[PDB]
Design an enzyme around this catalytic site. Structure first.
Site, PDB file in Angstrom:
ATOM      1  N   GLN A  17      71.058  60.362  66.212  1.00 13.51           N
ATOM      2  CA  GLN A  17      71.108  60.009  67.507  1.00 13.51           C
ATOM      3  C   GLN A  17      70.810  58.526  67.695  1.00 13.51           C
ATOM      4  O   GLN A  17      71.078  57.855  68.810  1.00 13.51           O
ATOM      5  CB  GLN A  17      70.565  60.795  68.736  1.00 13.51           C
ATOM      6  N   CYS A  23      70.261  64.243  72.376  1.00 14.45           N
ATOM      7  CA  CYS A  23      70.227  65.374  71.529  1.00 14.45           C
ATOM      8  C   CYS A  23      71.039  66.600  72.018  1.00 14.45           C
ATOM      9  O   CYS A  23      71.760  66.952  71.313  1.00 14.45           O
ATOM     10  CB  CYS A  23      68.680  65.782  71.450  1.00 14.45           C
ATOM     11  N   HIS A 160      63.909  69.254  73.454  1.00 14.84           N
ATOM     12  CA  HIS A 160      64.814  68.653  72.371  1.00 14.84           C
ATOM     13  C   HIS A 160      65.844  69.826  72.041  1.00 14.84           C
ATOM     14  O   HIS A 160      65.621  70.732  71.620  1.00 14.84           O
ATOM     15  CB  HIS A 160      63.921  68.454  71.253  1.00 14.84           C
ATOM     16  N   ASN A 180      69.644  69.629  63.346  1.00 18.99           N
ATOM     17  CA  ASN A 180      69.048  68.649  64.085  1.00 18.99           C
ATOM     18  C   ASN A 180      69.900  67.448  64.136  1.00 18.99           C
ATOM     19  O   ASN A 180      70.976  67.159  63.649  1.00 18.99           O
ATOM     20  CB  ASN A 180      67.627  68.347  63.666  1.00 18.99           C
TER      21      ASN A 180
END
Lengths: 213, 4
Positions: A17, A23, A160, A180
């Site tokens: 990102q 996110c 997140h 992630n």
């Protein structure tokens, strides 16, 4: 008893990102990508920018909800490929192009709040699922291996968004496999194993959803 | 939820 969608071609390479709180976009595209493979037999990188710059119900680099993203894709009748609408790490004007459309969405479903069993069923029966967690702890951030558990993780502080690409067990500790959006450099090649059936640790089942295709 |  376990499942790992990475092995099955349902998962794209780990993204980064950069300096943008996008996110949610990465999580949404990840779920969409998984459905694309499942429905069509193949996938490609979808474009998070498209979401950052076009999901007005969200806050761009300031945060967003995955469900709002899924809704946009449906209403818009499509989302662009990454190649079509590349990620630049800042919000810009909406430049969606139908020529670039690489997937569609016919709606979404939310996992029942707090229910890990339901989440497991969704991962098994659907594929990768968008989730949100508390990723604020120092210990989460410096993660490298094992099955992460830290009791101080706050299930009511979902700061997140990430993607559950599977579930399993390692040395007797049950886990979720989590993709992630902090680069391949972070964690275990961009992934983390997060504790499963330990009282909804880090709020993993608090804000879970998937797109319909 | 603040999901970023």
């Amino acid at each position: 008893d376990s499942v790992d969608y990475r092995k099955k071609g349902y998962v794209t390479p780990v993204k980064n990102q950069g300096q943008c709180g996008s996110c949610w976009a990465f999580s949404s595209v990840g779920a969409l990508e998984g459905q694309l493979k499942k429905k069509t037999g193949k996938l490609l990188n979808l474009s998070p920018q498209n979401l950052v710059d076009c999901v007005s119900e969200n806050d761009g680099c300031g945060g967003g909800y995955m469900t709002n993203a899924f809704q946009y894709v449906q209403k818009n009748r499509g989302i662009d490929s990454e190649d079509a609408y590349p990620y630049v790490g800042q919000e810009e004007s909406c430049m969606y192009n139908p020529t670039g459309k690489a997937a569609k969405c016919r709606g979404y479903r939310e996992i029942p709040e707090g229910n890990e069993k339901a989440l497991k069923r969704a991962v098994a029966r659907v594929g990768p699922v968008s989730v949100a967690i508390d990723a604020s702890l120092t210990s989460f951030q410096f993660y490298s291996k094992g099955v992460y558990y830290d009791e101080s993780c706050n299930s009511d502080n979902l700061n997140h968004a990430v993607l559950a690409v599977g579930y399993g067990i390692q040395k007797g500790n049950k886990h979720w496999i989590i993709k992630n959006s902090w680069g391949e450099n972070w964690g275990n090649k961009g992934y983390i194993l997060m504790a499963r059936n330990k009282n909804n640790a880090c709020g993993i089942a608090n804000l879970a959803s998937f797109p319909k295709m | 939820x603040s999901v970023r």
